[PDB]
Amino acid sequence: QLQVANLPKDHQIQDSSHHQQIQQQEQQQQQQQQQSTCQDTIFSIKKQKQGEIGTYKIRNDRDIPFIAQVFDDNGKPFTNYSSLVFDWKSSDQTQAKW
Amino acid sequence: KGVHFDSCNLDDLEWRVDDSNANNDNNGGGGSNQERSFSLLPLQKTNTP
């Protein structure tokens, strides 16, 4: 499957300030309301069937990293698969380009 | 193969109609009940059949 590559942020030192959990829940409840309407967005990728191409809305004028997630066909991701060779493509290298 | 259980009461099943185009949209939208070929009928609250 294709997915957007959500990179980690920098590992800043883990302060234990409990207040952060409140502002995380404030954002999660707003995101749960936005998840009713914003479902067309590239951040809302639903796991496709084989060959089931999905339309997703995305804003222009940026670079974006993607990840090729590989599974066994019991459905499990492999804990390493660094023996495979990948092939990255676009229908138009003016509109969107690796 | 060719044998079943002698009886089954398990009536509350999670029956659905599925729509063939619903690929992307993880959204709580009230989709228009006009484009479907079929509808699931209500269970009556008449005497037990």
Q: What b-and-e string marks burial along B29-48, b requiring 16 or more CB atoms within 10 Å of the CB?
A: eeeeeeeeeeeeeeeeeeee
CB A84 within 8 A of CB A70: yes
CB A58 within 8 A of CB A2: no
User: Do A48 and B27 lie within an 8 Å CB cutoff?
Assistant: no
Selected residue of A34, A36, A58 to mutate for chain B interface (largest B Cβ count, 10 A) = A36
CB A4 within 8 A of CB A64: yes
Selected residue of A32, A34, A35, A39 to mutate for chain B interface (largest B Cβ count, 10 A) = A39
Given in angstroms, what resolution was this structure solved at?
30.0
CA–CA dist A60, A47 (Å, integer): 24
CB B24 within 8 A of CB A56: yes
Q: Which tokens belong to B3? A: 């044998």
User: Do B26 and A54 lie within an 8 Å CB cutoff?
Assistant: no
Alpha helix stretches (DSSP H) within chain A: 19-37
CB proximity B24 to A under 8 Å:
yes
User: Do B24 and A37 lie within an 8 Å CB cutoff?
Assistant: no
- Residue A76 burial by Cβ neighbours in a 10 Å radius (0-12, 13-18, 19+): exposed
DSSP state of B35: S
B24: number of CA atoms within 13 Å, CB side?
Answer: 14
CA–CA dist B23, A39 (Å, integer): 11
The secondary element (H helix, E strand) that includes residue A24 is helix A19-37
